[PDB]
């Protein structure tokens, strides 16, 4: 299928090149460098085509990731072969530096041959049985990340949780894995949808499975009805003739009292033609940064069911005063020690029928950590 | 942070 | 009779001592750093008898854990092994798993357990069970 | 001579041991570990000896490293072994840590054979022939440490600066080198002392040599009179009662006004009893330390034949006021980009005889750079 | 900075 493969750095030359077909020549290689790096005309489609000649075109760091063939097949699947390139690469030689890339001549030729034949991608399947641990142990970490677009009259425009299960087991032996939460759908809670790892088998849905080695991913899910809010946030403006702004931020602390916040981030919006901001906080630092046209609040930490609020001067320049400044939503960035989802863990039903030794020899840990999503909140 | 089970 | 009992780390951190006649603290904790000199430089292959002075110490290993204990001269040394040893296999069969922060959280429950079968300088309590049974019944009630 | 050779961690933990000599015994790596790290006397000498037995211990990182021997041996060739032991080491592998000095059982083993025998160290000589540039290029760079106690009654207690010579040559050849400055001792200055190189030939005295290949150090040199002093520090201490300090602290910037200063840092000393200091810096920023007694003003760039102080209210807590605060002298450490010693290059004569190239060919880049050591001013 | 010897 895929014939030429090429990579390129910010620079723009090329660092390594290997085609499986006979079709792909250099003219591919300097018209991609020519009309992506070299060309002007920033607004683009991720993939393009010219001449009959389709080129796939992803930059991370710095360095660009070319892929180029005739036929039509599956976007996709390539897409993912591009991306467990890149992660094995990571995973080989940690930051991708284009020294690093280039130190690696050898892993390169080899990976590429044996990964991909004529663009042909070639590679219990999770965990072997010779595993042992005298201490059997397992953490549970729980992200949630929340997503909000909240309007300027008191109503949530939209909410949405992506949620990912990260645990680290240590234990002995073939364990057979009972995962037990509130999936009543009394505490309770629905699970709009959900994807698993290869080990979770179908047969209230529970988890029953045996776990990789170490750490994994036993299941990806998706929450949007019934989210507990972390935060409100009360926007205030008024305009004073055409020199200055008066705008004063609250935010609500939607969570328990005995809950610290941490790493506490409110971004305000300025016009431009803001002359000057004067910075008031009886909780934290506060600074005004005129180049971003923003204002910077930060709170250490601040306590559930509390408010908090910064009073803010911002003096306007002069201008075209006829066109209106159009406010952009007030941005907070965050991270929770709970999940905004609400799920419980019943249990984890874990045993060894093979090996002699009880549920009460597991160590099982749990801890829950919300981070931010985009809560922007319009004004 | 991490809570027992 | 028992002088005096030590539970102590590799690096020599203090968790737990239990005196039974009167001492002072500066003494206390000086005894405490030579002991725990004495006892760290030892291994696996050697006599778990040493005698210093007027005292004599016994003391054995669990994966990472010093154990010392701290009696009189003429007292019956290896019945004092075993009855440490039956205070490790209780411990470990209390918990379903024995570790360090068992020890760090479960401090007044090995308290409890101690004054249980250790008073005076002297075993009190030996049979396992019945150990197990007051255990039960004392963790019950508030 | 040196039989065992031990070397711990912070932890207290033997990490890699070998021993040369039927001498040595676990004895002694044993009482190393509680006679050092376990013990609370920490008033001792760099070297210790007990029953007849010498130990050596010096730290770097979190690393031990201990010599043991029997015999009267001198000391400095023992010590300059062990510098060339960690210094190999940290060119092996970078940065001296555990697990880093973990991972290379082979490299030690190997090199304990090899570089030392039985307690014995073993290991033009500078550059080789085949050494080709095409663009024949050389950097300087001028390092001077500045060192000063300053009186508070206006006059320089001590002053002496320890400088070395830093040069970056890329040559093709065997150049031939003749170093011209002002030697006179019209520009000219005083050579104090002076220590060079293995390439330096004896034969105003020059310094005629081949350099050896890339980055070296061609002398070593020590100077002590005639140093241009970089700042001038005005110290003013007021008492009020016996609750507050007025302190303001006036520094002269003693160099040419075309010249910007860089990262200035001033340390004003405080008592402990200090209850509270309000800052006031017109350039840069001022902060308040209680805990360290100190008051942080930090300067971004001032000029030369200027001026800069800070208004200081020093509120002390009431006390044993009868023991009057013994006053530290007033630290700045800071950056300048020129030699305060005052050194003029008048040339470097470099040759190819071999070659059919001329000097012209030779790319000469020269360039100042000097550090604060220790510059202290009484109050 | 660096200079032109």
């Known amino acids: 299928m895929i014939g030429g493969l090429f990579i390129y750095n910010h620079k723009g030359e090329v660092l390594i090149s290997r085609v499986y077909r006979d079709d792909i020549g250099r003219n591919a290689v300097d018209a991609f460098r020519v009309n992506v790096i070299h060309a002007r005309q920033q607004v683009r489609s991720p993939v393009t085509n010219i001449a009959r000649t389709s080129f796939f075109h992803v930059k991370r760091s710095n360095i660009w990731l070319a892929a ?55 590679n219990i399947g999770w965990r072997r049985e010779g595993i042992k641990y005298r201490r059997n142990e397992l953490f549970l970490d729980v992200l949630e990340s929340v997503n909000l677009l909240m309007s300027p009259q008191g109503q949530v425009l939209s909410a949405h ?10 234990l002995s032996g073939m364990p057979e894995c009972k995962f037990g939460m509130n999936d009543k759908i009394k505490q309770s809670i629905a699970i709009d949808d959900c994807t698993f790892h290869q080990c979770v088998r179908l047969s209230e849905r529970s988890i029953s499975f045996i776990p990789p080695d170490g750490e994994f991913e036993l299941m990806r899910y998706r929450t949007t009805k019934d989210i507990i809010l972390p935060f409100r946030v009360i926007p205030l403006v008024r305009e004073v003739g055409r020199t200055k702004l008066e705008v004063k931020v609250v935010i609500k602390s939607n969570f328990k009292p005995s809950l610290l916040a941490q790493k506490i981030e409110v971004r305000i919006p300025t016009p431009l033609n803001t002359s000057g901001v004067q910075v008031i906080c009886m909780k934290g630092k506060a600074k005004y940064k005129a180049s971003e046209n923003a204002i910077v609040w930060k709170i250490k930490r601040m306590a559930g069911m509390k408010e908090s609020q910064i009073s803010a001067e911002i003096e306007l320049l002069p201008t075209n005063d006829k066109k209106k400044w159009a406010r952009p ?45 985009i809560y922007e909140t319009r004004c | 942070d991490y809570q027992r089970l | 009779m028992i002088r005096f009992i030590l539970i102590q780390n590799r690096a020599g951190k203090t968790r737990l001592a239990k005196w039974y006649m009167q001492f002072d603290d500066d003494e206390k904790q000086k005894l405490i750093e030579e002991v725990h000199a004495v006892v760290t430089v030892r291994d696996a292959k050697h006599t778990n008898f040493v005698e210093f002075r007027n005292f004599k110490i016994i003391y054995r290993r669990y994966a990472g854990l010093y154990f010392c204990i701290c009696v009189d001269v003429n007292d019956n040394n290896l019945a004092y092994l075993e009855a440490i040893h ?35 300088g002297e075993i009190r309590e030996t049979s396992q069970t019945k150990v197990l049974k007051q255990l039960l019944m004392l963790q019950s009630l508030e």
């Open chain 1, 161 to 170: 949780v992506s949620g990912r299960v990260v645990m680290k087991s240590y």
């Open chain 1, 329 to 373: 939503p007030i941005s907070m960035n965050f991270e929770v020690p709970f999940a905004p989802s609400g799920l419980k863990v019943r249990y984890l039903k874990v045993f060894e029928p093979k090996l002699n030794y009880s549920d009460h020899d597991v160590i099982k840990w749990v801890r829950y950590i919300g981070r931010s999503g």
């Open chain 1, 68 to 122: 180029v063939t005739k036929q039509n097949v599956n976007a996709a699947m390539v897409f993912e072969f591009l991306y467990k390139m890149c992660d094995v690469m990571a995973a080989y030689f940690g930051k991708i530096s284009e020294e690093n890339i280039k130190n690696n001549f050898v892993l390169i030729y080899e990976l590429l041959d044996e990964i991909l034949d004529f663009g042909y991608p070639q």
């Open chain 3, 86 to 120: 039956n205070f490790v296999e209780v411990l470990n069969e209390y918990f379903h798993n024995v570790c360090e922060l068992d020890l760090v959280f479960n401090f007044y429950k090995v308290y409890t357990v101690v004054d249980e079968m250790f008073l005076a």
